[PDB]
Design a protein around this ligand. Structure first.
Ligand SMILES: [Zn+2]
Ligand SMILES: [Zn+2]
Ligand SMILES: [Zn+2]
Lengths: 54, 772
């Protein structure tokens, strides 16, 4: 489950982690509704922790 | 068409539910990982250092910029969902401050990043299925790295666009985009080469003659110091009639050429230019593009099989008939039945049809049963019009509705199946007497007034759609499959005869029209496609689809029973080229020609090698060889066969060299004992001219008497195979063993003929064995 994994996949993974960490500090399925005024419906899977718990 | 505006700028996936617009970069990216460790948008946002995205109109959320409900912040790296309590609503907030404990009231403790496991949340942006991603362009983390940098000041660039030599043809391909990048250039080399060649064939001071203008349109005949329907431009130079210019199509190939207002009083000073058309090359590129860009053009199975990927075997859910023999056609043999049976249950098959083994009837039988699965018309092709015409006729015998589609430039050409030609079927549609009326006017006049013409064209499209849409079978050349009239049409089942004689891009023109069941018929031990440009040929364009697949390890089904040769003649080629697998459908008794009192060196084996030890010489051309002694011996053998009873038009003389072919015709004209006409009907040519053709008796003239690399059947096993499998009743090889034996294939041949006691010497009357 790696594909054709490069030395620049490592860099991205590390780049992505840092990017989330960096941008904060300065400051079968289940239907859910999403806000937008307007509402829209998303199918959340049973896999997820939002479904798996609820 | 190209890909849509919203296609992933890395891999081209364009499902609206999967694509995310980067607002800074003004480009789209899918939410599939592909070959990378993270989704394609996330790959892009990290590298390009963007944070602001929008979803797609035709997607689920509609066209919404992703932003914090509370404060409007668009930074996807700060965004996540939180759910209400006991309630199935969910909002997008930035974690801090908007989604923080004190700031909130909603459940801050269940906040979930927009970006999960290096992708956008699947349940907001759909993740392309694996079959979709395996179909997309296979870009690697590193190529993205490079592509993303090539965009820092050339945003319009692609992976395809990242001099010297062209890339060599591969066996396996990452995807069809690589396939196009490899073949595309090669096709461009042949097109540019061909064009240059055609425009260099142009000739200056040609004497033209005419045919009476009683047939409305006029004919022009001339001989120059090359195919039917080829557009030729004739221009008159001089002052016997004002400077003239006219285009005509070739109707008679060769010396004499013949092409169907003009100055029919004058003879001398005409100029011949050969008009070049890009059509076939244009169509080939088109197919390569369609293959790369349109996921519907061929089935997932066929896509992956053609590119050399591992694909699990699939049984086609078709129904086998009760009797495999088609109506109108004679009973198939065990070998042919097994082929038909096997191929109907598979999405992709190769049939190998050795010389004499019944390809056409087998293919016609297969097409008949496909036709009756009822899933629209079967598409049947071949690289050449003669092969299509042969297959078209056999299919028609089964009583199916067949339409022969041909080039508009070849509509004046006749063939036994002209009556099946679309243009002729349209002319005979009594159901549309308006079209017939407007067609009457066209044929008694020059092209018609713009109102008349719009109407004519409209009804002609109607006629065309009527005939094609209702056809059980459509027959045309590979390249002819790219005709505009068949665009807009899906072909689930396709069969290509003689595919080993087309280049891949050629062969792929029909395949990219919806193939879900593809059958390639051919023989990779007989001649392959002609490729005029060395650079392209060396780069691998001479390899056919059939061949590549065979090398890949796909094992063709072989038609095993041959019906053409006397057993003695099949023996050697069978053993060397066909794994000793050919069975004889005709007995020795069955293959003694009637009215033929010829005394073979061994009576029951009708073949031999006559030793000639002539010196070769270079033909005053400067560019070939001839052997005068050998040619003498050939006429004498030709004369004996004629005296023995053989029909002249059933004698073929095959020779690798023009110089020999040319000398050989001259010699018999000026030095044979028999009447001059009799020899004149004996066909003399290269093996290329005898492909797919047969004679009662074949004489080979090898010409070379010194050590030599050789051209033609002297050094090509496939050409030797064809050379030895044209004759029904007998074959005689004339050459120098010492010269030929250097080649190990000929060594075997000579050792075999010797072992059969049929390598001989001395005068024909008193022929003896050769003690070499
Ligand atoms: Zn993508
Ligand atoms: Zn961007
Ligand atoms: Zn906010």
């Amino acid at each position: 489950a790696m594909g054709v994994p490069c030395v620049e996949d490592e860099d991205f993974i590390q780049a992505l982690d840092k990017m989330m960490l960096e941008n904060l500090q300065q400051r079968d399925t289940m239907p859910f509704v999403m806000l937008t005024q307007q509402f829209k419906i998303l199918n959340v899977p049973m896999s997820s922790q939002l479904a798996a718990n609820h | 068409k190209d890909l849509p505006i919203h296609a992933c700028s890395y891999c081209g996936i364009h499902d609206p539910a999967c694509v995310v617009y980067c607002n800074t970069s003004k480009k789209w990216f899918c939410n599939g990982r592909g070959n990378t460790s993270g989704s394609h948008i996330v790959n892009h946002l990290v590298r390009a250092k963007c944070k602001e995205v929008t979803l797609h109109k035709d997607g689920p959320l509609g066209e919404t910029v992703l932003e914090c409900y509370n404060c409007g912040c668009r930074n996807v790296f700060l965004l996540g969902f939180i759910p209400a309590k006991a309630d199935s609503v969910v909002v997008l907030l930035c974690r801090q401050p908007c989604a923080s404990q004190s700031s909130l009231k909603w459940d801050s403790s269940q906040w979930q990043p927009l970006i999960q496991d290096r992708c956008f949340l699947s349940w907001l942006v759909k993740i392309p299925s694996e079959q979709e991603q395996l179909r997309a362009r296979q870009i690697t983390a590193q190529q993205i790295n490079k592509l993303e940098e090539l965009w820092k000041e050339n945003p319009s660039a692609t992976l395809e666009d990242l001099d010297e030599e062209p890339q060599h043809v591969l066996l396996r391909y990452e995807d069809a985009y690589q396939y196009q990048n490899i073949f595309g250039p090669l096709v461009k080399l042949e097109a540019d080469y061909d064009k240059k060649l055609k425009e260099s064939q142009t000739q200056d001071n040609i004497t033209v003659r005419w045919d009476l203008g009683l047939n409305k349109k006029r004919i022009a005949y001339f001989t120059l110091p090359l195919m039917q329907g080829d557009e030729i431009c004739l221009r008159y130079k001089g002052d016997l009639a004002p400077l003239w210019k006219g285009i005509g199509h070739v109707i008679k190939v060769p010396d004499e050429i013949a092409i169907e207002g003009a100055p029919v009083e004058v003879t001398h000073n005409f100029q011949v230019d050969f008009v070049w058309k890009s059509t076939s090359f244009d169509r080939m590129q088109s197919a390569l593009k369609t293959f790369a860009v349109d996921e519907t053009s061929v089935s997932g199975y066929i896509y992956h099989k053609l590119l050399g990927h591992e694909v699990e075997d699939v049984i086609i859910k078709c129904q086998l008939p009760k009797r495999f023999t088609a109506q109108g056609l004679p009973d198939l043999n065990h070998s042919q039945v097994y082929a038909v049976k096997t191929v109907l249950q598979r999405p992709l098959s190769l049939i190998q049809g050795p010389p004499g083994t019944g390809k056409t009837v087998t293919s016609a039988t297969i097409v008949y049963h496909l036709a009756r699965q009822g899933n629209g018309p079967v598409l049947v092709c071949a690289p050449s019009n003669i092969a299509v015409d042969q297959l078209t006729e056999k299919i028609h015998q089964t009583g199916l509705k067949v339409v022969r589609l041909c080039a508009k430039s070849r509509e004046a050409i006749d063939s036994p199946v002209s009556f099946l030609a679309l243009h002729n079927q349209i002319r005979n549609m009594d159901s549309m007497p308006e079209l017939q009326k407007l067609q009457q006017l066209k044929d008694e006049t020059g092209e018609l007034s713009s109102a008349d013409e719009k109407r004519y064209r409209a009804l002609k499209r109607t006629a065309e759609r009527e005939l094609l849409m209702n056809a059980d079978v459509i027959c045309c050349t590979c390249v002819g499959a790219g005709d505009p009239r068949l665009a807009k049409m899906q072909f689930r089942s396709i069969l290509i005869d003689e595919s080993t004689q087309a280049t891949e891009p050629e062969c792929m023109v029909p395949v990219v029209l919806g193939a879900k069941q593809l059958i390639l018929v051919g023989d990779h031990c007989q001649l392959g496609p002609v490729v005029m440009c060395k650079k392209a040929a060396k780069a691998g364009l001479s390899q056919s689809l059939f061949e590549r697949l065979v090398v890949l390890g796909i094992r063709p089904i072989r038609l095993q029973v041959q019906y053409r040769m006397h057993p003695a003649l099949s023996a050697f080629p069978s053993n060397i080229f066909y794994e000793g697998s050919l069975q004889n459908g005709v007995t020795a008794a069955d293959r003694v020609k009637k009215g033929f009192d010829f005394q073979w060196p061994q009576p029951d084996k009708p073949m031999f090698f006559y030793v000639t030890q002539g010196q070769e010489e270079i033909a005053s051309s400067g560019t070939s060889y001839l052997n005068r002694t050998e040619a003498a011996n050939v006429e004498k053998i030709t004369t004996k066969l004629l005296k023995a009873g053989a029909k002249p038009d059933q004698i073929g003389i095959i020779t690798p060299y023009e110089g020999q072919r040319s000398y050989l015709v001259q010699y018999m004209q000026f030095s044979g004992s028999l009447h001059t006409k009799l020899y004149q009907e004996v066909e003399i040519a290269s093996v290329d001219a005898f492909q797919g053709r047969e004679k009662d008796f074949i004489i080979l003239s090898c010409v070379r008497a010194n050590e030599h690399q050789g051209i033609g059947f002297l050094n090509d096993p496939r050409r030797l195979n064809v050379a030895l499998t044209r004759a029904r009743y007998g074959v005689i090889i004339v050459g120098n063993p010492k010269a030929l034996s250097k080649q190990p294939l000929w060594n075997h041949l000579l050792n075999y003929y010797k072992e059969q006691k049929v390598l001989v010497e001395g005068p024909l009357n008193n022929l003896r064995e050769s003690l070499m």
